[PDB]
């Protein structure tokens, strides 16, 4: 499928040369921290759908 | 017949042996896969590869070498390189953890759990040889493995193999540059092995090779690859006497008798010529006299130790290629006529000449221009006390307040071993001076 083809297509990450990152994480506007340790037994493991 | 078993110890010995064998395979005809074309062989009775390769019934030519290291970082490179098929899967022994620039770790804790396997591999190499001339051990006493486990292997080899000849090509610490802080300690600890259990010792410090590569090879970026290529060229030039016929054929003991005047006086400097680039080759008169003069000049020598500041005792010149005995003798005469270099009083001749008809062959992608005639020097001279005195001074400076000594103490050495090694090296330097002193 053509949509499946685009979904398979992915962008390969840039190399992490030190000092060239620019604090990208500041652009999230919601910083809620889900409690995945201590109350969640699955520890938020990601498993694909069947 | 005429076999010589190569034993590469440590990382530096491993790359030196890799260069030596990539030179030997192309010299004789063996492909990187270990096979040999039928044409690179004069007939059914050709035996040039016999001294360095064993011919298997399946067509391979397995080198008579043992690579030995305490860490897999070099043997895995060998097994991923171009000579994985060439090299025997065994005789390529590696440990798990490196000695980490520690003679104690290489000689008392982790070398002891490797030395017997190394000896078994050496025995399985030697029993395949019916005319073994001797062992040729390539190492650097600068590091930990090559110092400690090298000394252990040399000691056990001397114990079990009796009076077999042993050529130790060792990369000593250079006078100025070094890549360790405990390297003077390692060299001082290993000098006893290099003195007693090494039958003839050869100095191959990286310093003179780097300076030579800069000034003669016109190479703006010299490196370990080039240094090891040059060392392999020197080794091939020396050992080609029994590999290829010549006017004056010599063997291991044949030049050893002329090279070593006394059992304790066996440390010999080495040099090679004409070690020049392709661009420079067609700009200079590459005669036998010219190459001999370049040899006797300190510029062409592989150890930073000026012989014109000392006295020569016995110089052995291995000429290869289209050389002629008249050219050899005329070069020898014009060398005697030069007063910059003095032979010791009790050795009037002081000259050994070995002529071989096979010119050196250059490795592709190499740097040495293949010259039709070449000459290598193995010279015993009293000037060699300079480097031993300098390394003794470095050892004294390091050991004045017992710095870096806690690892050597805690990894299975007494505190007195350092003093014993220092006094042994001082006695060696003193006896060089005694033998070099005039009557």
């Amino acid at each position: 499928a053509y949509a499946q083809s685009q979904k398979m297509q992915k962008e390969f990450r840039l190399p992490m040369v030190p000092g060239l990152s620019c604090g990208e994480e500041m652009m999230r506007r919601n910083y809620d921290r889900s409690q995945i340790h201590g109350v969640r037994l699955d520890c938020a493991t990601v498993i694909a759908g069947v | 017949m005429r076999e010589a078993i190569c034993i590469h110890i440590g990382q530096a010995g491993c790359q030196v042996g890799n260069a030596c064998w990539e030179l030997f395979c192309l010299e004789h005809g063996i492909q990187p896969d270990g096979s040999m074309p039928s044409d690179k062989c004069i007939g059914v009775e050709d035996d040039a590869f016999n001294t360095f390769f064993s011919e298997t019934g399946a067509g391979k030519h397995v080198p008579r070498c043992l690579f030995l290291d305490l860490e897999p970082t070099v043997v895995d490179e060998v097994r991923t390189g171009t000579y994985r098929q060439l090299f025997n899967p065994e005789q390529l022994v590696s440990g798990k953890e490196d000695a980490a620039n520690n003679y104690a770790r290489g000689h008392y804790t982790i070398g002891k759990e490797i030395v017997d396997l190394a000896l078994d591999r050496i025995r399985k190499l030697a029993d395949n040889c019916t005319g073994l001339q001797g062992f040729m051990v390539f190492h650097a006493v600068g590091g930990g493995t090559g110092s400690g486990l090298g000394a252990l292997l040399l000691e056990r080899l001397s114990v079990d193999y009796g009076k077999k000849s042993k050529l130790g090509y060792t990369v000593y610490p250079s006078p100025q540059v070094s890549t360790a802080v405990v390297e003077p300690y390692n060299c001082v600890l290993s000098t006893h092995s290099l003195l007693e259990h090494t039958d003839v010792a050869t100095m191959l410090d990286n310093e003179a090779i780097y300076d030579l590569t800069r000034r003669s090879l016109d190479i703006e970026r010299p490196s370990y690859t080039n240094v090891n290529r040059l060392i392999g060229q020197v080794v091939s030039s020396l050992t080609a006497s029994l590999r290829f016929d010549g006017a004056l054929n010599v063997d291991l003991t044949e030049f050893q008798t002329n090279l070593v005047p006394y059992p304790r006086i066996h440390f010999v400097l080495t040099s090679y010529a004409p070690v020049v680039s392709a661009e420079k080759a067609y700009h200079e008169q590459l005669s036998v006299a010219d190459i001999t003069n370049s040899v006797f000049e300190p510029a062409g020598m592989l150890t930073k130790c000026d012989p014109r500041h000392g006295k020569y005792m016995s110089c052995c010149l291995m000429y290869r290629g289209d050389v002629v005995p008249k050219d050899v003798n005329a070069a020898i005469a014009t060398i005697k006529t030069k007063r910059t270099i003095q032979f010791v009083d009790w050795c009037p001749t002081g000259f050994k000449c070995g002529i071989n008809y096979q010119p050196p062959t250059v490795v592709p992608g190499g740097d040495l221009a293949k010259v039709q005639r070449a000459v290598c020097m193995i010279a015993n001279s009293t000037a060699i006390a300079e480097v031993f005195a300098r390394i003794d001074h470095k050892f004294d400076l390091m050991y004045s307040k017992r710095a870096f000594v806690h690892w050597y103490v805690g990894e299975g050495m007494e505190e007195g071993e350092f003093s014993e090694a220092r006094e042994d090296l001082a006695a060696l330097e003193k006896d060089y001076e005694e033998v070099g002193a005039e009557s």
Binding site: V17, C22, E24 | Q11, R221
Partner: protein
């Protein structure tokens, strides 16, 4: 061979999170664990930091460990969080309160059972463990006290294995905790007497690098931890990739620690260019060494001018020629013998790795055993005297079970270390 990494406290956990991000990028590991890499050499020695699963998924040999599960939640919900193993997470029920005593004796003593239970498993899950690497901050409670408790027990169980402690030393100008003198003084002697090679990192020097060496506009802790990740990857690049002159953790220890107590080093990374500065500088071995020995590039805040270099180490990466690198590393000594030590000829150790980092022609990591770290130790000790003299912020430690003379014997070790640094700096031949 393999290296197992523990990360204690929120600081150490974030340090290790960025470190594992960098290592996963270098070895081509998708955050989903599946391999994504580029060259054969990446997987030749991936097992030093990653253990393989049944399906080929690579899981770091990482022990995330702290009393506050909030940082665990952050790192696990981050971009590369799904890479870590679940049981490797150890969490309590309450925070450390930035208290060394609480982290080391009351709260950390109950968690250390599970910490060591998972740490021994991760340590003997490899064929030949090379050593342990704990990332933490000395100013905090759970990162410093509980991390040093882990270090002490790990040294007790594995006496021969090498130990590194990437400790983020605080500074009074950047004092992000008022009991920082207490916690740092209590942890430094633990590191002295139970860490094979500590690793002093200072926020002042990292921020100075970000402002003048990098000229970043708004650099956050991600940018700051990128540098510590770089040095943490550099110190083991020799193990992870083949090189002309390979080395290891024990190599560095032997060539860098002249005496057992002098195992504190200051770091530095090169190349490290400003925003609009790549076109103004040519990346070569000379400028690598210039930036490496360059003062502001030292990512621990202590001026090398006022001290003398006991030992130095340079772990160069990339395809190079050894003659230029040792030219540079000998000539620096030749024209700066005043800043070196005479009675140790060639204070410098050099190592070469054939694989440069991701997207760089060259790189180098500096290990500096300079005697001027005695200035940091004395600055910590003076303020420890100031706080301990008036019993300020001491009732917490005393009520958490500790005795008063603990502080006295830790500061005695501080004074002994400072005295040793001074009398090795001023010693002659």
């Amino acid at each position: 061979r393999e290296i197992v990494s523990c990360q204690a406290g929120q600081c150490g956990n974030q340090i290790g999170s960025k470190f594992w991000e960098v290592i996963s990028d270098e070895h081509g590991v998708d955050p989903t664990g599946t391999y994504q890499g580029d060259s054969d050499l990446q997987l030749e020695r991936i097992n030093v930091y990653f253990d393989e699963s049944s399906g080929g998924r690579y899981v770091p040999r990482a022990v995330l460990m702290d009393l506050e599960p909030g940082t665990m939640d952050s790192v696990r919900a981050g971009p590369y969080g799904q890479l870590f193993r679940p049981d490797n997470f150890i969490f309590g029920q309450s925070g450390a309160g930035n208290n060394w005593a609480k982290g080391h004796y009351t709260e950390g003593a109950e968690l250390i059972d599970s910490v060591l239970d998972v740490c021994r498993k991760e340590a003997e899950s490899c064929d030949c463990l090379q050593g342990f690497q704990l990332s933490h901050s000395l100013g905090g409670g759970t990162g410093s006290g509980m991390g040093t408790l882990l270090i002490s027990k790990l040294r007790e169980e594995y006496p021969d294995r090498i130990m590194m402690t990437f400790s983020v030393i605080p500074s009074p100008r950047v004092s992000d905790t008022v009991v920082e003198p207490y916690n740092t003084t209590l942890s430094v002697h633990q590191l002295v007497e139970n860490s094979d090679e500590s690793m002093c990192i200072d926020n002042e020097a990292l921020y100075d690098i970000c402002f003048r060496t990098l000229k970043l506009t708004t650099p956050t802790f991600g940018d700051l931890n990128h540098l510590v990740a770089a040095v943490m990857s550099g110190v083991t690049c020799c193990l992870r990739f083949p090189g002309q002159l390979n080395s290891d953790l024990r190599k560095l220890a032997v060539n860098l620690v002249p005496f057992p107590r002098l195992h504190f080093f200051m770091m530095g990374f090169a190349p490290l260019t400003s925003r609009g500065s790549q076109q103004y500088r040519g990346l070569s071995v000379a400028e690598l060494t210039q930036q490496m020995f360059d003062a502001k590039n030292m990512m621990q805040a202590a001026d090398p001018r006022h001290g003398r270099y006991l030992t130095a180490s340079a772990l160069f990466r990339g395809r190079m020629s050894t003659k230029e690198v040792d030219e540079q590393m000998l000539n620096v000594q030749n024209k700066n013998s005043s800043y070196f030590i005479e009675w140790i000829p060639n204070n410098i150790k050099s190592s070469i790795c054939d694989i440069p980092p991701k997207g760089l022609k060259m790189s180098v990591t500096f290990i500096g055993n300079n005697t001027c770290i005695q200035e940091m130790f004395r600055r910590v000790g003076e303020q420890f005297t100031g706080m301990f003299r008036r019993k300020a912020f001491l009732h917490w430690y005393t009520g958490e079970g500790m005795d008063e003379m603990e502080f006295t014997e830790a500061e005695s070790n501080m004074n002994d270390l400072v005295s040793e640094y001074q009398q090795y700096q001023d010693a002659t031949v």
